[PDB]
Amino acid sequence: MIESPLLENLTGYIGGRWKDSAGGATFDVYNPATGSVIAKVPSMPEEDVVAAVEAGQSALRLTNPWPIETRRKWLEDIRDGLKENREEIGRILCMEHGKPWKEAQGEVDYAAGFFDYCAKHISALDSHTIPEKPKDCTWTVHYRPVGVTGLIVPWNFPIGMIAKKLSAALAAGCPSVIKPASETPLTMIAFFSVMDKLDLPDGMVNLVMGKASVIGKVLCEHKDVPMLSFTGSTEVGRKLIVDTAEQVKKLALELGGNAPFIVFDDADLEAAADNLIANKFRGGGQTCVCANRIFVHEKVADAFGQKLAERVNKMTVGDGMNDGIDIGPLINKQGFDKVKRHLQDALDKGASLVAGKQPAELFFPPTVVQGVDREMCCYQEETFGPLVPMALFRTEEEVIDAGNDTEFGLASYVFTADAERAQRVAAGLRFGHVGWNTGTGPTPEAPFGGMKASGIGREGGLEGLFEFVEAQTVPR
Amino acid sequence: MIESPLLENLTGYIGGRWKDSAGGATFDVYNPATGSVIAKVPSMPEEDVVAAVEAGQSALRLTNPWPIETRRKWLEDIRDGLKENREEIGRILCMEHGKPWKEAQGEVDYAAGFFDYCAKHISALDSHTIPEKPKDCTWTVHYRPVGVTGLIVPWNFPIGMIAKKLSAALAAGCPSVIKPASETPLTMIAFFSVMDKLDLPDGMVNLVMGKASVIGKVLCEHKDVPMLSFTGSTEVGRKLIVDTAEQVKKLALELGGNAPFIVFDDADLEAAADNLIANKFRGGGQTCVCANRIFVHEKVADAFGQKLAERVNKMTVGDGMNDGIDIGPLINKQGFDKVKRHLQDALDKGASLVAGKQPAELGDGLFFPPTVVQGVDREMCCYQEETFGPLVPMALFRTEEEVIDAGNDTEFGLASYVFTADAERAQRVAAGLRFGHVGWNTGTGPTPEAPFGGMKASGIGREGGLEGLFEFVEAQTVPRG
Numbered sequence: 001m002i003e004s005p006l007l008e009n010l011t012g013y014i015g016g017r018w019k020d021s022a023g024g025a026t027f028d029v030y031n032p033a034t035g036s037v038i039a040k041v042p043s044m045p046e047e048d049v050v051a052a053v054e055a056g057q058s059a060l061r062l063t064n065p066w067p068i069e070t071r072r073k074w075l076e077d078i079r080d081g082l083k084e085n086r087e088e089i090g091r092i093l094c095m096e097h098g099k100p101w102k103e104a105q106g107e108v109d110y111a112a113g114f115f116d117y118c119a120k121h122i123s124a125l126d127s128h129t130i131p132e133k134p135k136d137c138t139w140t141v142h143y144r145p146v147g148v149t150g151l152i153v154p155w156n157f158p159i160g161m162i163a164k165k166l167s168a169a170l171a172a173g174c175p176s177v178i179k180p181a182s183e184t185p186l187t188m189i190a191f192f193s194v195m196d197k198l199d200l201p202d203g204m205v206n207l208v209m210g211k212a213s214v215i216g217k218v219l220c221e222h223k224d225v226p227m228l229s230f231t232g233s234t235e236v237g238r239k240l241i242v243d244t245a246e247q248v249k250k251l252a253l254e255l256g257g258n259a260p261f262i263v264f265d266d267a268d269l270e271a272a273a274d275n276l277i278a279n280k281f282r283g284g285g286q287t288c289v290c291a292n293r294i295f296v297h298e299k300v301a302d303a304f305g306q307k308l309a310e311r312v313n314k315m316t317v318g319d320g321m322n323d324g325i326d327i328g329p330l331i332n333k334q335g336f337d338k339v340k341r342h343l344q345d346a347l348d349k350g351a352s353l354v355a356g357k358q359p360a361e362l363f364f365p366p367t368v369v370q371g372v373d374r375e376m377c378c379y380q381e382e383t384f385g386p387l388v389p390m391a392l393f394r395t396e397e398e399v400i401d402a403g404n405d406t407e408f409g410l411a412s413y414v415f416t417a418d419a420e421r422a423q424r425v426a427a428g429l430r431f432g433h434v435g436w437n438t439g440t441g442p443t444p445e446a447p448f449g450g451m452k453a454s455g456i457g458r459e460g461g462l463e464g465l466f467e468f469v470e471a472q473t474v475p476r
Numbered sequence: 477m478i479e480s481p482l483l484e485n486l487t488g489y490i491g492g493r494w495k496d497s498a499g500g501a502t503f504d505v506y507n508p509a510t511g512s513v514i515a516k517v518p519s520m521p522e523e524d525v526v527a528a529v530e531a532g533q534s535a536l537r538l539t540n541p542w543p544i545e546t547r548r549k550w551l552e553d554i555r556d557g558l559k560e561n562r563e564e565i566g567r568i569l570c571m572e573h574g575k576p577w578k579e580a581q582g583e584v585d586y587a588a589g590f591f592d593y594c595a596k597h598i599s600a601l602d603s604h605t606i607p608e609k610p611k612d613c614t615w616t617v618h619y620r621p622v623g624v625t626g627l628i629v630p631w632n633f634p635i636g637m638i639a640k641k642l643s644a645a646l647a648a649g650c651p652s653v654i655k656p657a658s659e660t661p662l663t664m665i666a667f668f669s670v671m672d673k674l675d676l677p678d679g680m681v682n683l684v685m686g687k688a689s690v691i692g693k694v695l696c697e698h699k700d701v702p703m704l705s706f707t708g709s710t711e712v713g714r715k716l717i718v719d720t721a722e723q724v725k726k727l728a729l730e731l732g733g734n735a736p737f738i739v740f741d742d743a744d745l746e747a748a749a750d751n752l753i754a755n756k757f758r759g760g761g762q763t764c765v766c767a768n769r770i771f772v773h774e775k776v777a778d779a780f781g782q783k784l785a786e787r788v789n790k791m792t793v794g795d796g797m798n799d800g801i802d803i804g805p806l807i808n809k810q811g812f813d814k815v816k817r818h819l820q821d822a823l824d825k826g827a828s829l830v831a832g833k834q835p836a837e838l839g840d841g842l843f844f845p846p847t848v849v850q851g852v853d854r855e856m857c858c859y860q861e862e863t864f865g866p867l868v869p870m871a872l873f874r875t876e877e878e879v880i881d882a883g884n885d886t887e888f889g890l891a892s893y894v895f896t897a898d899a900e901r902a903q904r905v906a907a908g909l910r911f912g913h914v915g916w917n918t919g920t921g922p923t924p925e926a927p928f929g930g931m932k933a934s935g936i937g938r939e940g941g942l943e944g945l946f947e948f949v950e951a952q953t954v955p956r957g
Contacts, residue, residue, distance in 0.1 A: 062907045062908045063880075063904045063907050063908045065907070130925050130926060130941070132925045134923045134924075134925055135918070135920040135923065137916075137918050137920060139923065139925065139926050141926055141927060141941065142906070142907075144907070144910075144931075146931070147910075226931065226932065234724070237724070238721050238722060238724065241717060241718075241721035241724065242717075242718055242721050245714050245717040245718050245721075246714055246933075247887075247932075247933055248710070248713065248714065248717065248729065248731065248932070248933040248934075248935065248936065250936060253724065255724065271957070275957070400539075407723075424539045426618070426952070426954050427538050427539050427541070427618070427620065428538050428539045430538075430623075430950075431952070432950065432951065432952055432953065433952070433953050433954075434952060434953070434954045435954075435955060435957075436954050436955065436956040436957070437956060437957045438611070438612075438613055438955055438956065438957030440611045440613060440955055440957070442953070443608075443610045443611065443615065443955070444610075445606050445608040445610060445615065446606055446615050446617055446953045446955075447617060447951045447953055448953060449951070451622070451702065451950045451952075452702060452723070452724070453722075453723055453724045454724075455724065456724065456726065458951055461606070461617070461953075463951060470910075470912065470931045471912065471927040471929070471938050471941075471943055472906065472911070472912060472913070472914060472931075473912065473913050473914070473922070473926045473927055473928060473941075474906050474913075474914050474915075474916050475915055475916060475918050475920055475923075475926075476916040476917060476918065
């Protein structure tokens with residue numbers, strides 16, 4: 001059983017109060033490393049969620065809005081709370097997620113970064129008066145809080161994800177009802193424990209936990225929740241669009257991906273291998289930003305694969321708390337099985353094994369396979385595991401089409417020394433994020449979001465700041 | 477039957493060509509003023525709508541975009557084309573909608589200003605490099621065309637609506653497939669006739685017409701139509717959301733509204749009265765920007781009704797082709813019956829008839845006289861529903877807080893208006909009003925220079941101003957190492 005100064009209150013949080021009405025109802029939180037229960041978390045009822053919304057609604061202030069300077073201070077204080085607690089918050093993340101302790105701490109730093117960007121740029125929501133005076137009026141445009149919002153996040157980034165949402169929601173003056181994945185609630189609870197000591201207005205942030213059905217239902221149907229920001233499965237997200245259609249709710253969605261990582265025959269192979277590894281095994285591959293389809297030009301395919309094998313073979317798998325562990329365990333059995341299945345499917349269909357073990361011999365080790373085509377499962381769906389499937393290509397036009405050969409359009413990466421070709425590939429890829437000779441993911445300073453089925457809206461950057469506002473135009 | 481040089485091609489417009497596969501399949505357009513059929517338009521099949529998309533897809537240039545000056549010239553040419561053919565489009569508009577010729581022409585002017593505004597501000601979509609350099613990279617943000625869009629518009633503004641959508645979509649480099657209401661296809665045809673002579677790329681604009689089911693279904697299902705921009709009924713809007721959820725399509729939605737027009741006891745009454753009459757009766761009240769609930773402070777209610785009845789009685793209803801007509805017929809029997817039913821309902825429940833006729837006296841036409849009822853409360857249909865007709869329902873109120881809750885007492889949040897000599901109070905009202913548009917001592921509607929759209933169930937996204945320019949683009953972040 002886990003114990004932490006950040007978790008002395010193992011319960012919900014409503015209107016400035018740690019509380020719940022589960023009546024002892026509980027759900028288990030496992031450590032994927034030990035296969036053991038590390039905490040029993042209150043499984044909260046419908047009524048707690050409704051209580052949460054009433055509290056948020058009561059912190060919402062339109063006629064007498066919290067001032068810009070007051071909000072900026074919450075933002076700074078949160079940035080500072082995360083940084084101060086990185087080690088312990090990161091510890092809890094490692095234990096419920098699997099992710100190595102060091103990487104987990106870094107995610108906390110990353111989270112801090114989003115609060116920092118919103119604090120410095122919160123003025124971007126300042127209302128403005130256009131210079132033109134049509135129909136003999138003066139026209140002023142305001143950005144109103146959208147209202148109480150539900151922030152829903154997956155286990156993929158137990159702390160980084162909510163940071164992207166909460167930072168922009170607070171900047172806009174929106175109270176929020178927050179729901180974490182039942183796989184990684186503890187990092188949430190810890191996070192609230194830190195905020196609990198920062199003098200946020202009662203009901204500005206609220207925490208509900210438990211059965212997805214119970215929480216999701218209230219949040220979808222409630223008339224005082226004009227907006228949902230959801231990150232998670234495309235399946236669940238599509239059900240959200242349907243279930244919020246009558247009220248025509250405002251949605252921010254970041255869903256599944258199928259990131260093509262493209263390496264040209266004129267690529268800097270060493271940089272590309274280095275970037276690939278950094279990109280791919282972050283979170284044991286369990287990311288929507290992680291490369292999923294590696295396209296390598298025939299002329300350098302063999303040398304590239306060997307470069308990844310040299311790198312991949314020096315990596316270690318195991319318990320992430322221990323030191324010197326590069327990748328931890330996958331989140332659960334269902335996730336492990338899908339990765340094993342993709343491995344089998346590729347080999348059975350005749351891909352070759354460049355690095356890693358045979359599925360029969362299988363914690364999932366870093367694995368590289370070569371000779372992948374559109375017929376393999378791992379090409380058609382996202383692996384969410386430490387698997388590197390290499391596909392071949394020769395032409396620019398071919399690889400762009402193959403790149404775009406998917407429902408999705410979240411992240412992608414292109415490596416080439418021809419700057420003009422790199423630029424065309426970026427324009428041609430129907431993805432919200434394109435790495436140009438880098439495999440680096442989204443940053444708080446810039447928009448991240450998907451085209452096609454990968455989502456709606458952008459988080460991070462200028463546009464991220466506008467997620468939780470409604471433009472209101474006022475002629476005088 | 478209607479004859480015009482702008483209507484020498486009464487058919488669709490795909491890939492530069494006037495064509496269709498209707499095989500003779502027709503639908504009728506009526507002049508709401510005469511009850512006569514004025515045109516028979518081809519009822520285009522699935523395959524025509526799919527062709528429209530293929531054409532558009534073929535004009536989509538991701539990797540070798542149409543240069544920003546080229547796109548700028550299109551907008552400029554279109555803006556000039558509208559202004560030039562402003563009287564003949566106004567004519568066709570008048571006859572199919574019912575709106576008076578003047579008003580119609582003015583709508584063409586209004587449409588032109590969206591194109592103008594987008595030409596002046598097209599530079600807003602330029603990619604930009606941020607000053608920060610996290611993770612050793614230089615970060616550039618691009619705004620790519622979303623891809624081929626479907627532009628779907630209602631009959632309320634046969635030229636104004638489409639103008640909002642197409643000006644932004646061209647500025648973006650988005651080829652579009654365009655679907656007007658079957659009640660008002662001719663203004664659309666006229667518009668395409670005007671654009672057809674402007675050297676646009678084959679496939680940049682495309683026109684489809686016919687059965688809503690048919691057209692709508694292709695646009696929802698097709699994988700090359702990443703985005704839909706729809707103005708129309710909240711009902712159909714809800715259906716679009718559901719029918720495009722699987723692909724998670726990007727949608728812009730401008731749907732129904734229930735606009736509260738609020739008048740304080742310290743308000744300049746003559747100005748509010750003036751404003752009310754101009755806002756309410758435009759398009760014969762058949763607009764989502766038209767006041768639907770008029771909240772008046774008890775201390776000025778009586779004087780206010782007088783002022784309104786005074787102006788209403790001077791107004792004139794008739795065929796809009798004739799000079800001196802302030803308001804023309806309503807669009808159809810369904811619309812007429814609704815305005816009638818809200819009038820009946822109000823009087824059945826106690827409302828007083830300050831101006832206009834008792835429902836049983838209403839003519840055999842679609843002509844509905846400007847009417848004013850007093851004594852209206854939340855129990856009444858016209859308060860609960862949007863009336864879309866020349867009806868002015870007056871509800872009383874006392875306090876600021878009471879009237880703000882009253883204004884928000886609706887599914888929607890499109891437009892709203894407040895009159896008050898108190899400027900600090902006026903600002904608290906705008907703030908508390910969950911509406912995308914709030915008139916401050918004015919009743920004017922949306923403008924190309926500023927964002928317009930709904931909070932709540934009135935829609936998703938904004939047209940006009942800056943944010944409108946960003947509707948038809950996908951932002952793309954490109955860090956470079």
